Structures are given as C-alpha cells and as structure tokens.
C-alpha cells in the first residue's frame, strides 16, 4: 500500500505548509486552503485501506457530521467563533476516544506499549470532549459563564484524576469490559470538573489548552494504531497548541496554571 503511503505523505506536507502560512498575516488566508486540500486527500485515500467494509455506514456518517457542522459554522454570528472552536474541538477529542475504546474492546493490542499509548490518548481525548463541551455551554448561554465553585473542589478534582489514572493503568494488567467503561466515564467526568471553575474571560485559554489536548490525543491514537496521517497531524497540533496556549495566557496577562488550577 504504497499509494496510500504516498497520499498520507502528501497530506502531512500540505498540513505543515498550511500551518506555517496561517502563522503569518500576509499568507494566512492561503494557509487554510493548503490545509483543506490535505484533508480532502486524506479522507479520499482512506477508502482504499485494505480490508475495509461498511462503506455505506462510513459515507452516511461523513455526510451527517460534516453537513450539520458546516450548516452551523456558516449561520452563527462571527462574534460566536470562539465557542464554535470549542464544540468542534470537543468533537475531535471524542473521535480520538472512540478509536481508543473500540481497540481496547477488541483487545487489538498484542504490545503493552502500544496499549498504553491508546489508553493515554483515550484519557486526554475524553477530558477534551467534556471539557470543550462545557466551554461551549458556558459561552453559548446554555450555562451561565460565571465560575461554578464549591467546598473542597480542588481536592475532589485531584482525587477523580488520580482514580482515572489508576483505573487506566490497571487496564494494562486486566482489560475487562467493566474497567474500560469505568475509565472512560471517569475521564469524561474529569473534563466536566476541570472546566466548571473557569470563568468567561479565561475561557479562550482553556479552549486553546483543550485544543492542544485533542491534538495530542489524535497523535497518540495514530502511533498506537499505526496511522501516519494522525501521527504527524496530531503531534504537530499538540505541540503548536501547547505553545499557543502559553502565548494566549501571556498576552491576556496571566499564567496557564492560574486559569486551569
């Protein structure tokens, strides 16, 4: 499968040139275009993967997701773009989480190290999923924008993270279905917990941070399942997003630690 490798190679280049051109004002408009061509080529090449079935399901899901997302993007006021970034970010994190869940349920990993990677991407994708949904709900009006604070919240949140990580690690020794479902549900609950204390004006930083997280999750799933399109794009965005979050914090007069905990 040289032709799919060739295609994915071309996709990474187009994403890299796209990202580069988006970082400078004079070339930014053109940069989203180079990136878009990469995404088109990635989706097209992927129908030729060996052993694929369910072609009608695939095509239906692509259409439902993309039409409704496109329909929402073009009809909201421009003033509402930061929340739209949130919900689309959340969804990608969810998508990484589903890749990890199916592969853990199949018991597809013979290698422990590739398993760990799949697990870590699942925690991080999950957190970003519910975290990004709360960021959206707060800026949209469905929830109030104000901090949701309470008695002993810091300790609760830490205890849920510690427990999410213990049960995740335990899957390397025993991957029972009940443990799997419990790991995801605890990672999903943590995303909620982490965003509750974050106010309206701080929310761009949190959203940038969840963007970095989804990228990383996508990268981790890529390495775990051996897909280069996701290895490169996910790692590239994870790294770029990590820095971008630091820069947004500095420009908005603050620390990332201060907002996030």
């Amino acid at each position: 499968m040289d032709l799919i490798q060739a295609a994915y190679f071309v996709v990474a280049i187009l994403f890299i040139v796209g990202l580069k051109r988006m970082a400078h004002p004079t070339t930014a408009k053109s940069g989203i275009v180079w990136a878009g061509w990469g995404m088109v080529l990635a989706v097209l090449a992927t129908f030729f993967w060996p052993g694929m079935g369910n072609f009608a399901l695939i095509l239906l899901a692509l259409l439902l997701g993309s039409v409704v997302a496109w329909w929402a993007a073009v009809r909201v006021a421009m003033t509402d773009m930061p929340q739209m970034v949130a919900i689309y970010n959340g969804m990608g994190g969810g998508a990484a989480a589903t890749i990890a869940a199916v592969e853990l349920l199949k018991g597809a990993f013979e290698n422990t190290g590739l398993m760990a990677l799949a697990i870590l991407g699942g925690l991080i994708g999950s957190v970003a999923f519910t975290g990004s949904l709360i960021a959206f709900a707060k800026l949209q009006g469905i929830m109030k924008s104000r901090p949701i604070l309470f008695p002993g919240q810091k300790a609760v949140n830490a205890l849920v993270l510690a427990l999410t990580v213990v049960i995740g690690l335990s899957l390397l020794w025993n991957d029972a279905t009940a443990s799997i479902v419990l790991f995801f549900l605890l990672a999903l609950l943590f995303g909620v917990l982490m965003t509750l204390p974050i106010g309206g004006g701080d929310m761009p930083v949190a959203i940038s941070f969840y963007n970095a997280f989804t990228g990383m999750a996508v990268g981790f799933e890529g390495f775990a399942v051996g897909n280069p399109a996701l290895m490169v794009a996910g790692t590239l965005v994870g790294a770029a997003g990590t820095l971008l979050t630091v820069l947004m914090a500095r420009a908005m007069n603050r620390s990332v630690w201060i907002s996030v905990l």
């Binding site: 989203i32 969804m91 890749i99 199916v102 965005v237």
Partner: protein, 94 residues
C-alpha cells in the same frame, strides 16, 4: 501501515519540535485564527475513525465507530468553515 519503533520515535520528536517552532512570533491578532486552523488539522482524526468503522465486526463496534466518524467529520468540516470565516478578516470590504 505501521513504521518501525525508532523511525516512529524520530517522526514524533521532529514533528513536535516543528509544530512548536512554527508558532514562535505568531502576532497576537492571529492567536484565535491559528487556534481554529490547528483545530481543523487535528480533524484528520476522521480518517482513523473511518478505519475503525471499516473493520468493525459487531453491532457495538459499528455503533461506536459510526459515532466517531460523525464526531471526526464534524471537527473537520466545521473547523474548516469557522477558520475560513475568521481569515476573511485579512481583507477589505466588497
């Protein structure tokens, strides 16, 4: 479609160094458009959800993979449209 361990590891650190370095000196007015453009790129997660749905044998695998392709597709299409709209702001007024 897997690469060896050491080659994959090189690919990870080099791409990580790269993504970091392409964002140093981004001006403040591009912070949110870049967040949005980078958000659109990790949209390529749809492809990995395609392969999952494509190899799924049980009703459960199919249902989880179906949901992932929708989620992935949404990230890619909506992330594209949002980024295109924000970068109109690097023009005039027709």
């Amino acid at each position: 479609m897997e690469f060896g361990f050491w080659s994959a590891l090189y690919i990870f650190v080099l791409t990580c160094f790269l993504g970091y370095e392409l964002i140093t000196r981004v001006p403040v007015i591009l912070h949110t458009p870049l967040m949005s453009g980078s958000n659109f790129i990790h949209g390529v997660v749809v492809v990995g959800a395609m392969v999952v749905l494509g190899h799924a044998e049980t009703g459960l695998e199919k249902l989880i993979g179906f949901l992932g392709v929708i989620l992935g597709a949404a990230n890619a299409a909506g992330g594209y449209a949002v980024t295109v709209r924000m970068l109109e702001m690097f023009e005039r007024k027709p």
